[PDB]
Amino acid sequence: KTITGVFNSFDSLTWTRSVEYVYKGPETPTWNAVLGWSLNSTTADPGDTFTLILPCVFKFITTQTSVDLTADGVSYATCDFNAGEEFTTFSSLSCTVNSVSVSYARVSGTVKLPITFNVGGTGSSVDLADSKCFTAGKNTVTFMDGDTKISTTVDFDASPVSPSGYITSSRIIPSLNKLSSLFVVPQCENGYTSGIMGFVASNGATIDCSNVNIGISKGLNDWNFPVSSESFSYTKTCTSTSITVEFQNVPAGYRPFVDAYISAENIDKYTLTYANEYTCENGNTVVDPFTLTWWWYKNSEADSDGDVIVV
Numbered sequence: 529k530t531i532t533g534v535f536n537s538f539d540s541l542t543w544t545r546s547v548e549y550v551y552k553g554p555e556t557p558t559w560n561a562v563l564g565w566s567l568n569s570t571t572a573d574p575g576d577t578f579t580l581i582l583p584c585v586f587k588f589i590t591t592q593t594s595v596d597l598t599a600d601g602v603s604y605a606t607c608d609f610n611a612g613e614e615f616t617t618f619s620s621l622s623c624t625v626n627s628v629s630v631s632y633a634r635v636s637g638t639v640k641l642p643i644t645f646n647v648g649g650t651g652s653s654v655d656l657a658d659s660k661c662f663t664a665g666k667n668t669v670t671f672m673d674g675d676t677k678i679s680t681t682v683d684f685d686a687s688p689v690s691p692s693g694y695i696t697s698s699r700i701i702p703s704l705n706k707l708s709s710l711f712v713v714p715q716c717e718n719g720y721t722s723g724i725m726g727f728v729a730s731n732g733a734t735i736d737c738s739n740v741n742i743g744i745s746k747g748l749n750d751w752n753f754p755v756s757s758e759s760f761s762y763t764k765t766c767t768s769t770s771i772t773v774e775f776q777n778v779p780a781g782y783r784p785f786v787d788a789y790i791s792a793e794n795i796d797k798y799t800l801t802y803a804n805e806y807t808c809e810n811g812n813t814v815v816d817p818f819t820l821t822w823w824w825y826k827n828s829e830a831d832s833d834g835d836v837i838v839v
Contacts, residue, residue, distance in 0.1 A: 531571065532674025534578045534597075534605070534623070537564035539638060541669055541682045548826040548837045552685045553751060554645035554662055555699065555839045558589040561643055563671070563678065565597050566636035567604050567625065574627035580607070581672045584661035585619040586646035587611040587702060595621075599637030602628060607639075612646065613701050614708070617657045619643070644839065648753025649699050650708045650787040651741030656757060664750040686750040691715065694804055695752040698822045698838040701789070706736060707838055709800060709822070710787040712748065716808030719780040723806030726764075726772035726786055731821075733798030737766040739789035742773050744782040754785050772803060780809075797823040 539562040543552045563580075588609045597605040607623035621641075648659030664686030670679040689695065695712035713725050729735050742764060743757030762775035762784075771788050778784050792798040799821050807813040823837050 529573075529576050531576050531578045531625075533676055534567060534572075535563050535565045535580050535671070535673040535678060536676075538562075538669070538671060538678040538680040539564055541680050547829040548823075550830070551688060552683075553687065554647045554684045555586065555649070555751070557644055557839065558642045559644060561641045561669075561671075562638050563641065564636065564638055566634065567597070568634045569632055572625045574625050576625045578605075578623045578625075578673070580621040580623065582619040582621075582641075582643065583670065583672070584617065584645050584647070584658050585612060585643045586658075586699075587613055587619065587644060589642040589644060595639060595641065596626075597623070597637060597639050599635055602630070604628065604632075604635055604637075611703060612654065613703055614650070614652050614654050617646065617654050647751050648749055648755070649697055650710055651743040651745075651754055651757040651785065655753070656755065659749045659753050659755045687752050689752055691748055691752050694802070695748065695785075696800075696802070696820060696836070697753070698790070698836070700824070700838055704789070705793060706739075706789040706791050707822075708787055709790050710753070710785060711802055711804075712745075712752065712754065712783050712785040713804070713806050714814075715783060716778075716806060716811065717780065719782070719809040720775070720778040720784065721807040721809050721811075722774070722776050722813075723778075723784065724772060724774050724803050725784055725806075726770065727800040727802045728770040729790060729792075729798060729800055730769075731797070731799040732795035733790050733792040733800065734768045735766065735771050736789035736791060737768070737771070740766055740771060740787065742786045744778050744784045746782055748783060754783070758782070760784065792824070796825070796827060797821050
């Protein structure tokens with residue numbers, strides 16, 4: 529049978545600082561969610577199943593496939609991780625009650641889930657939906673076990689990057705062994721005449737042309753991600769080494785952007801070179817190419833200018 533109500537509290541949600549990760553953004557590893565759970569042998573049998581839904585969670589920051597609900601050395605249930613990634617706007621746990629050698633009546637404990645949230649990152653439908661999950665500052669984070677909600681408050685820092693410049697972001701998609709990578713053109717408040725946007729991959733990275741998004745977004749959210757993806761006039765060329773989009777007239781209030789999946793499999797880091805040209809309406813063409821090295825993990829540690837770490 530299916531049981532509900534096993535996870536019965538959301539005790540704390542805290543960010544663990546690494547050497548390479550500096551601000552407490554929603555997508556920055558690692559947020560740890562500590563939940564309270566309990567089981568009662570009169571209402572749950574070994575092999576009964578239960579699920580926990582984690583809206584707006586992109587993935588679990590672990591290599592393990594499962595985590596156990598344990599107390600005082602004993603494993604009372606095992607929960608498989610099912611990350612949302614670019615498949616769903618939520619993640620979940622699928623859990624089963626375990627058989628045990630010593631019988632128990634009622635037991636309870638806590639479990640810690642290492643996660644990052646999805647507040648956007650590409651023009652995909654999942655990312656555009658989750659770009660509206662949270663705002664900078666105080667938010668309530670809720671998970672659901674059957675029909676019951678368990679909640680805590682959190683404070684998320686907004687991006688320290690100014691929204692009006694170019695934006696770049698790279699995020700690992702662990703189940704695909706790929707990353708997504710995003711580039712948003714600098715802001716032309718009164719619209720664009722034309723521009724060229726995109727990136728060429730080098731130093732171990734290739735672009736997956738089957739998984740690209742090109743759009744204009746009506747502004748960006750608090751972490752500078754696209755919040756919509758409307759139609760516009762452009763032409764594009766995508767190869768395994770380069771994606772380039774040349775666009776014409778974009779209206780005031782919109783920001784053109786391009787993202788694609790990147791494979792960068794046996795390396796600590798890869799390089800993207802961004803063309804970055806744009807012409808604002810009644811302005812002159814700006815040509816401002818730049819290069820970034822994206823590190824899978826770092827490793828340097830926490831360096832600066834041109835060196836950025838993936839989330």
